[PDB]
Design a protein around this ligand. Structure first.
Ligand code: URI
Ligand code: URI
Ligand code: URI
Ligand code: URI
Ligand code: URI
Ligand code: URI
Ligand code: CL
Ligand code: CL
Ligand code: CL
Ligand code: CL
Ligand code: CL
Ligand code: CL
Ligand code: MG
Ligand code: NA
Ligand code: NA
Ligand code: NA
Lengths: 251, 252, 251, 252, 251, 252
């Protein structure tokens, strides 16, 4: 009756069938307060859960933590409680020079550099969003005035070697990932993050609608530090966008 | 001024086209071209029949691919060499879901890579996904036409027979990898089987080209394995009308 | 009782149990006319089908198209209609300096750089010809006066990156295939083509006899461009050779 | 003197610590720290709560990891940048063998790599193995506590549900790879499931860092009896006392 | 210069460029004694080495031990000493009902169920014999009066689970190998052994000529136990055949 | 009352032995047995020479394995059929870390699975790790002999030549997979190369058998590729003394 990790029951969600799923627990209240009647439900580990109302309909907001494994738990347990549509909002590192800090990326497919996706579908299966969710996210992102990019995201189980970072304790990257950032760049991949491959694969193979939208907080090719106000505005815009995408999905 | 190696056409032959409609069957090429203005035969060699036509005053090239990723990859490469940047696949397909009926249209949002040629462009982790603008145009064309349209995942196989878990064959054998695969895909929500989309979509998405796929359902695999001939012509006619309208939506 | 792609019936084949399978539909009639009583049966898609008679026995000639996928359909449908022996005749690109334009290659095994072979047997299984077919092809090739090479062929699902060609739209070759031509050269591989891995694997694992013979039309290591007469002679000799190999198989 | 990106601490904040105790749950950090002397809260961000304390006069870090290899890998990397060389994981686990009882303790001698992050450090052939000195210290601490201690292989999964072959789920299905997997691991002698050890052990064993894992058994997948509140409370308390004693044995 | 494992020098081989390579050290002297002037050279570990003369030419006989790893050492060291042609004679278990005890098998390709082959070529590469050696072995085997089968052999790194034996300590076969004997049977594979995949792959990728011939000593589908005389005749036949195959390779 | 297929012995011939010492070379078998009481020759066939002896009143088998995982797997299986449950491998090895000296001993804590036979017992994800008691006994016995002992990861290859990245060979070629591999392993902290531990440890850890490996260093790959039989002799007397003393510790 109460799911194992999230600490909520189906009745606690007041009929919600849509969830907004940021990674950071501290972002949950910030998203919920953009909607009506936000109420804290539970916090356990990296999972902070609020309910709110959007155009009269109940919406969940639930953090996922970093990575596919923790994300997979939250999605499963929300689905046990009746949630069928999942909107991820997150941050990302662009790897294309034409993408600027402050722009928004809607993922059309993920490079599966994770492990949890394989626990739902073999590697051949595409990590792709639900087309209605991606469509709603693009429209919401455009309506906010942001420059919006649609494209492929590389989704890594690590922050460091799987994103080909060398400024580390060992300074090494395993053979698999040596030269990988240039390979993705040349294949037109827009950005790196750590959860979309798991989220999209598990939802596309399980009868759940999912999509991902993110604000760009860094460009791996532009070694300049983005303006502070710009970072804060991007954060605020990203969560405005995801709430407006949720509105479009509720009709 | 030289011709490309397989297709037998020059850049001048394309008369400025930067969009191609790429059916599988050579016989569909003239049919598609004749839905547009000023259709002109360009060349035919092997499985590659090539026409040019005009749509709203803009040149479009129509080029068959043959069956499978290998022959498709050649056509896409050589057309890209001549300046084509947008590729609209139209084909036939077998439905894996019980509710998806003969004559319905499927627009692929991603492909299960049950092919080999896709791996010659990107490792298996890379998603076989369409360009979002092309998929959007295909959906709109299909829906505006009054068709019954499904968006979703397609299983794209290097074989017609074992890789689509057909048993009515010479040996009746399906290798271990493919035993029980149709029900697995069905349970995962996959809509349909075809043979070219994983290669096309992977190649294009990793090469700076815009591609999508739309297909008419010619069989429901929860019923049987071999498509009935009687419904092929009407489904084909619908499919090619849709793809030409999708091309119109992609112009300029 | 008409097979779906080829558009022929068992009765149309007049008892044939052997097929010659070129890639190009335009070559079918050219092979058939080397035999007695050639008759056109059907043309659909890349599949042009003739029957003929060789030493009083019926023989099919059927094109395959380019690649393993289209080849696999033709072989399957012909086997449904009683064909048990398949003789492929094709063109090939040599990658060894000692193999000249105009020589012939009989494949003793194929490097499986395809996908369709995996739909018949896992990768561990060898893509090898039937020993009687390969023996007949060698004998026929030698009897035509050609210089014949027996050895391994690399069989690719692509013409361009899987044969390590860089003169392409993108100019890139995926990691897997970077350096691959030199690797195959050092391993003694003779040539590239695009169908043998599928053909040989599907037949060797399905109770069908198969082999491949090819005339060398280019050498990836030679700057010289072969002349028109040499190429024309090679094309003609290849199809004479495959018909004489068929004669040896029928007794 | 940098602050690492996620953990929010500097090298100076660690007061020379070269050993960290790494529980999964942020709420357990303070409890472990308070078993030692002069615990000091350093930082909390996302799933990473960081304390310092003193053990026999030497500084020790306690830092939570979150659930899964990905978040664990960040914490280990950033601690290593700040001079930590020895990592002692204390966690909870589900036994899969009938002879292992709730309240027993498991010291992992190797992990089945059912994760993804381990592959970001070493190819699959590489063993997910603890440092022998750490495993020795954990065995000794666990046995000295009076617990029944099992040394053996742990299955380390990127999921809680299908990768541990759970069917009481939204879909009720498990992908082919994991169908029948619990029985296969049982027959191979595997003791338990958890979600972080493959990543931790592989990354440390291939990076010059010393690591090990000890866990109290809180459930047994083969027993229908439900353990009572007091047994669970004792097990949790024992686990963290054991890991602190193992840390004492590692101090030089 | 004395090779580390085999304990012989190039001069010890008296110009031999062909080796016969049985598995069992005890067979080496028996094979050598079928030729002229047999001379014991060395014995270390599983490697017993003789030289003899066949039609006036030097031939080495060297045992391999069980498995690809020990075989790979012997082949490498013999190649260092000038050997270019390797004729394996061994024993095998048939898996097809039509293959009887006392028949001979000449492998046309091997299913690579080993590990050492991967140390020479990726899995896509075919484990196939040199065509001349396979031809010589077929001729020698057929001329002896034996019933001879040409076809695919499954070459396993284990005797027990990789050959799907359940009469074992655990009674367990890992998932990969469950159902495998029936799969190979249905694919037309003739037999199991433990060395050919390594031998054939390493030689075919290294410029060395190799082949395998084996006497059938058991059939996994038969319940009758072969009698002592049949087994003795099969052993004797096998080594006579390999020597006659060597004679066909000299000239 | 079965006689096993390759080893040519029955369970009664072993006089109750449940522990085996398993060197590679048949010539070491009698040398090991004579360090124990009442050694008796049992059988010799192919690379398998089998003796029994008594250690502190308990029966012990000594059985050679040959080179490589395949032949080792046969001996272990057949000995287990005859009641053996603990397997102590002694062998030779090449060091890949500069600081390890010829004559040192290495006790494997886990193996890199660069073999094939291990996959016939467990999928690649499964760790090739020793029984903790056996590894502990081998460490203690090695230290007590006065040897310099190293504990760590071993790379276990199905070849002597390319899989150990040796270039002084007939072709001078190493396949892509293994190019750069020695440096890769050295940077990951791997101590040494040998050819049997991956198979032995995986087989046993997945089959309810206790196993470990100790090896004398006969070459350092920082200097050269080819060992020599002379360095073998001294390194070999101490190796076999150590493995017998490890056996004594396992029987106590
Ligand atoms: O270049 C970047 C930018 C952002 N992220 C995000 O950073 C978080 C960890 O801080 C992850 O959850 C991931 O989604 C990256 O992984 N890489
Ligand atoms: O069940 C079906 C129906 C259609 N196709 C399509 O049929 C063509 C061959 O007839 C191929 O191009 C392929 O994409 C299938 O693969 N499967
Ligand atoms: O270097 C060469 C020469 C020929 N082919 C053949 O060329 C055809 C495509 O033109 C394929 O069917 C293939 O068999 C190649 O692929 N590569
Ligand atoms: O049967 C069990 C018991 C415990 N855990 C632990 O449970 C946590 C999630 O609640 C993970 O971090 C994991 O280590 C499991 O995964 N499975
Ligand atoms: O059924 C059989 C018969 C023979 N062999 C051979 O038996 C030897 C081991 O006894 C190996 O070298 C192998 O080639 C098998 O592996 N399986
Ligand atoms: O550099 C070395 C030294 C020793 N060995 C051992 O050498 C034996 C063969 O001589 C094998 O059993 C193997 O374990 C190696 O593999 N590599
Ligand atoms: Cl977030
Ligand atoms: Cl969708
Ligand atoms: Cl079509
Ligand atoms: Cl915890
Ligand atoms: Cl260690
Ligand atoms: Cl033998
Ligand atoms: Mg270490
Ligand atoms: Na997490
Ligand atoms: Na084709
Ligand atoms: Na051996």
């Amino acid at each position: 009756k109460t799911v194992f990790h999230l600490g909520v029951t189906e009745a606690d969600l007041n009929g919600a069938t849509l969830a907004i799923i940021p990674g950071d627990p501290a972002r949950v209240q910030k998203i919920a307060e953009l909607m009506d009647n936000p109420v804290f439900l539970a916090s356990h580990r990296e999972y902070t859960v609020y309910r709110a109302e959007l155009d009269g309909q109940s919406v969940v907001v639930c953090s996922t933590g970093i990575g596919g494994p923790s994300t997979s738990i939250a999605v499963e347990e929300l689905a046990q409680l009746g949630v069928r549509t999942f909107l991820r909002v997150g941050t990302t590192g662009a790897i294309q020079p034409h993408v600027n800090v402050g722009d928004m990326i809607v993922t059309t497919g993920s490079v599966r550099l994770d492990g949890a996706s394989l626990h739902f579908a073999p590697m051949e299966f595409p990590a792709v969003p639900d087309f209605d969710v991606a469509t709603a996210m693009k429209a919401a992102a455009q309506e906010s005035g942001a420059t919006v990019h649609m494209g492929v995201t590389a989704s890594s189980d690590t922050f460091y070697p799987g994103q080909e970072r060398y400024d580390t304790f060992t300074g090494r990257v395993v053979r698999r990932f040596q030269g990988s950032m240039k390979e993705w760049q040349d294949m037109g991949v827009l950005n790196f993050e750590m959860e979309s491959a798991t989220l999209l694969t598990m939802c596309a193979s399980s009868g759940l609608k999912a999509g991902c939208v993110a604000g760009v907080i860094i460009n791996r090719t532009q070694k300049e530090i983005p303006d502070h106000a710009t970072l804060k505005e991007t954060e605020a815009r990203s969560i405005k966008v995801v709430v407006e995408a949720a509105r479009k999905m509720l009709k």
